[PDB]
Design a protein around this ligand. Structure first.
Ligand SMILES: C[C@]12CC[C@H](O)C[C@H]1CC[C@@H]1[C@@H]2CC[C@]2(C)[C@@H](c3ccc(=O)oc3)C[C@H]3O[C@]132
Ligand SMILES: O=c1ccn([C@@H]2O[C@H](COP(=O)(O)OP(=O)(O)O)[C@@H](O)[C@H]2O)c(=O)[nH]1
Length: 429
């Protein structure tokens, strides 16, 4: 049995898509060892079902994402040095056990792990967790074609400056983040396999352009559109609440695993959802409850809402009661919603979320965007009415369903992503 090592960047939007790919590979008979930091493992609550081996390495910085943002340039470099040393030591240990590791799939944000793989005699696969269109922008930043602070780039829609990946939002971490994004392509010619969590039909032209430079493998959605979650997802509570809701009546709301809204912005969102008279399921992370309005969680949301610190997002987006998804437009949420046929209300915050919202609204045509003044309740209510009631909203739903069907083709036999995972799997045999 071929033994695959997997090393995501320590954040849920990087762990989860690689985990789903690992589950697909394990179903084809590969042994998987998933390398997590101690900080990630502390939140891991369920993994006996997975049958994947989990091996921990130290965080490598003081006690992990929240330490990192205090000083991105320094602490990302300390994380890098520690991870290079600790993954080397772990691989040395795994080389004393059968089956021996053959390949290391690592997050594309850590391109320097390629040199660890090759030094240890492993193949290296860089796993890109953002779409081809956004990754192309990072390639152009590495080339100096573009510097991030109307924009035409090959095979991308014309973009406003607001649609470029947002790094100014990180203030003093701005420059450090821009260099890290561009670094994803710093050794691409030396990578053994280039894996993208997308499917061809979603971005035909830029995928074709990319494939003219390097052999790339589109293998997405990796999510299985359970063994599906590592972290606490409150599945029973969420799914029983959804099961009491009628078709097309629920606004699912989530800003992902990282982004945080100000107390004032949360007030705007809370009131927009109440004045809307729709049922809503709003993921508010535990460390972000306290910025909700006074009696919001315990009383005023009780009639129409479920406010929860984490949900089983794949199961929620697959539920017929969900009519639309108010999202920060992180790539996993965008692709999971698209593959589930769920139209979106885009409220992007930073990095690739800005560009994803543009693709959602103007290319794939499965969502509407809010306009800032902060984003006010009336703006949110207006977007909800657009999606939930208006004729335009029915068009967005039909478009989302057409993409769901194309994504279903891509991952089924003979589809582009199924074939590419097969090709990857065969190359290892
Ligand atoms: C700045 C920050 C946002 C605020 C929040 O409290 C956390 C902040 C620190 C971590 C930061 C995060 C923004 C997204 C990242 C840059 C992302 C990443 C890393 C390397 C790369 O190549 O591509 C993308 C994953 C995570 O490293 C991020
Ligand atoms: O209540 C939630 C909210 C999010 N997710 C998952 O967390 C990931 C969020 O990734 P994304 O790229 O959308 O945004 P990020 O957190 O990286 O900003 C996705 O895998 C979601 O499926 C989840 O399982 N439950």
């Amino acid at each position: 049995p071929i033994h695959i090592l997997a090393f995501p960047f320590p954040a849920k939007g990087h762990i989860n898509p690689l985990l789903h790919l690992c589950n697909r590979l394990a179903s084809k008979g590969f042994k998987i060892t998933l390398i997590t930091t101690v900080s990630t493992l502390k939140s891991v609550k369920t993994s006996k079902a997975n049958g994947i081996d989990i091996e921990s390495i130290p965080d490598g910085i003081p006690q992990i994402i929240t330490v990192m943002e205090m000083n991105m340039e320094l602490y990302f470099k300390q994380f890098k040095a520690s991870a290079i040393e600790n993954t080397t030591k772990l691989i040395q240990k795994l080389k004393t056990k059968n089956p021996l590791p053959k390949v290391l799939i690592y997050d594309s944000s850590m391109p320097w792990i390629l040199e660890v793989a090759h030094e240890q005699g492993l193949l290296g696969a860089s796993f890109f967790t953002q779409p081809c269109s956004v990754s192309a922008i990072y390639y152009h930043m590495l080339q100096g074609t573009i510097k991030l602070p109307m924009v035409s780039l090959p095979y991308l829609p014309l973009l406003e400056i607001k649609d470029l990946p947002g790094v100014q939002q990180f203030e003093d971490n701005s420059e450090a983040v821009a260099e890290l994004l561009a670094d994803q392509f710093s050794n691409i010619d030396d990578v053994d396999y280039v894996l993208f969590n997308t499917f061809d039909a979603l971005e035909i032209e830029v995928v074709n352009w990319m494939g003219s430079k390097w052999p790339i493998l589109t293998v997405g959605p990796t999510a299985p559109t359970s063994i599906n979650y590592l972290f606490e997802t409150n599945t029973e509570v969420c799914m029983k609440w959804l099961d009491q809701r009628e078709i097309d009546t629920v606004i699912y709301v989530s800003f992902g695993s990282l982004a945080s809204l100000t107390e004032e912005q949360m007030e705007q969102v809370s009131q927009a959802l109440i004045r809307s008279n729709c049922y809503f399921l709003w993921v508010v992370r535990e460390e972000e409850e306290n910025k909700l309005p006074k009696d919001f969680k315990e009383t005023t949301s009780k009639k129409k809402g479920l406010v929860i610190n984490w949900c089983p997002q794949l199961d929620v987006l697959a539920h017929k009661s969900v009519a639309c998804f108010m999202t920060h437009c992180g790539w996993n949420s965008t692709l999971e919603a698209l593959c589930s046929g769920v139209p979106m209300i885009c409220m992007p915050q930073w990095a690739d979320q800005t560009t994803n919202a543009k693709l959602i609204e103007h290319v794939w045509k499965i969502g509407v965007g809010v306009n800032k003044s902060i984003v006010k309740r009336e703006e949110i209510e207006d977007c909800i009415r657009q999606v939930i009631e208006s004729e335009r909203g029915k068009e967005l739903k039909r478009n989302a369903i057409k993409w769901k069907e194309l994504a279903k083709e891509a991952v089924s036999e003979g589809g582009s992503s199924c074939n590419n995972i097969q090709e990857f799997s065969s190359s290892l045999l």
